[PDB]
Amino acid sequence: SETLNPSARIMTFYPTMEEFRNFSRYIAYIESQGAHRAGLAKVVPPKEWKPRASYDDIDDLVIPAPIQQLVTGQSGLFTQYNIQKKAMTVREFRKIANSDKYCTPRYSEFEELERKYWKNLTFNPPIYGADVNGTLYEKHVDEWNIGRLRTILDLVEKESGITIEGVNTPYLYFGMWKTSFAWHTEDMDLYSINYLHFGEPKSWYSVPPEHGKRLERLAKGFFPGSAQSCEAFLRHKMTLISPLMLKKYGIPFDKVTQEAGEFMITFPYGYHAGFNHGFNCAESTNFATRRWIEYGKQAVLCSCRVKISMDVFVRKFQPERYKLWKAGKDNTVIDHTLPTPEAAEFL
Ligand SMILES: O=C(O)c1ccncc1NCc1ccc(F)cc1
Ligand code: NI
Ligand SMILES: [Zn+2]
Numbered sequence: 001s002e003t004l005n006p007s008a009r010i011m012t013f014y015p016t017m018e019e020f021r022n023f024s025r026y027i028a029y030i031e032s033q034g035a036h037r038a039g040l041a042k043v044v045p046p047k048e049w050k051p052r053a054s055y056d057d058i059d060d061l062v063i064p065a066p067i068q069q070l071v072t073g074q075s076g077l078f079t080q081y082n083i084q085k086k087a088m089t090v091r092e093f094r095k096i097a098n099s100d101k102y103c104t105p106r107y108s109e110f111e112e113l114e115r116k117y118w119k120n121l122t123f124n125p126p127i128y129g130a131d132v133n134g135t136l137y138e139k140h141v142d143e144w145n146i147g148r149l150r151t152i153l154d155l156v157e158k159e160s161g162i163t164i165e166g167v168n169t170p171y172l173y174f175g176m177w178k179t180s181f182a183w184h185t186e187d188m189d190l191y192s193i194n195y196l197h198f199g200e201p202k203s204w205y206s207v208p209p210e211h212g213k214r215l216e217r218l219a220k221g222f223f224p225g226s227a228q229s230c231e232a233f234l235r236h237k238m239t240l241i242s243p244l245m246l247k248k249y250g251i252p253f254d255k256v257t258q259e260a261g262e263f264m265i266t267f268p269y270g271y272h273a274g275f276n277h278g279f280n281c282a283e284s285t286n287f288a289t290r291r292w293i294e295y296g297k298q299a300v301l302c303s304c305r306v307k308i309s310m311d312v313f314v315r316k317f318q319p320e321r322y323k324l325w326k327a328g329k330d331n332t333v334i335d336h337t338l339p340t341p342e343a344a345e346f347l
Pocket of ligand 3: 232303
């Protein structure tokens with residue numbers, strides 16, 4: 001009923017080359033349609049548009065810190081541990097990925113492969129070429145350029161003088177079958193953008209920002225030690241929870257598969273997790289809109305080891321509230337249903 005409530009189901013958008021050219025505006029637009037309530041959206045770019053000519057010239061690209069993903073647990077609850085393996089090229093990676101030991105099993109419909117992920121994620125540890133600093137977009141590309149999105153996030157670099165790897169800059173992820181991203185929201189509960197350049201697909205789970213507290217209480221319950229140690233432990237990106245557990249404890253969630261050539265957008269306080277289907281390459285970064293600012297102020301951060309100074313945002317966009325805020329007396333309540341103020345124009 002809220003479980004099925006499609007005001008909170010993941011939407012897909014098919015913009016035109018005119019609609020597409022302006023990134024910030026199009027984000028405002030999909031929010032005017034409620035996209036943000038699912039916590040994740042898909043945007044299919046126009047058929048003409050291409051970030052690069054071909055992906056045949058990247059065999060030599062270096063993945064400095066490949067991670068091997070060791071998973072332990074049972075009954076739909078798992079903890080993922082990373083081992084940094086040594087540096088290796090895209091070609092060595094592809095070979096390992098497309099090899100007979102680590103390749104995608106046989107499947108008819110997406111749901112058979114999902115069963116095989118949840119049955120086999122603790123066996124046969126895959127290698128993810130994650131968090132590689134780089135961009136695969138050719139220099140000429142002006143539409144949806146992950147390297148330069150022109151949002152209000154740019155303030156961190158412009159005013160504050162600060163570079164934050166993978167947040168203000170783009171990252172690449174070379175996947176193989178059964179490589180995983182655990183349940184998280186973004187750093188400082190930012191938006192994210194993810195573009196699947198080539199290869200096999202990426203499946204996603206999303207929990208609506210209006211039920212994220214539910215997922216937090218659930219994780220806390222199942223990992224009481226972890227939660228005593230850090231009050232944002234999900235941010236460690238180590239915790240995997242299956243769809244069956246979510247259903248069982250009444251956490252609303254949706255799923256979607258991202259195919260090569262498609263963007264995914266995650267929204268503030270949008271919890272997501274997922275897995276790669278086989279060999280692929282995605283590019284991601286974070287970004288912001290005016291709505292983000294309050295989520296930024298309220299974001300509960302890891303208290304046991306990324307932090308963005310919000311002053312620069314409050315002074316500029318909430319000058320009237322700055323003193324009160326610095327005092328500790330601002331207590332706006334976030335309403336996760338509300339579009340960003342930039343979307344007034346779409347009525
Ligand atoms: O890998 C993805 O596709 C992904 C997607 C969305 N958010 C975070 C993501 N990855 C986070 C992550 C970072 C490093 C890892 F080793 C594993 C996962
Ligand atoms: Ni993410
Ligand atoms: Zn922590």
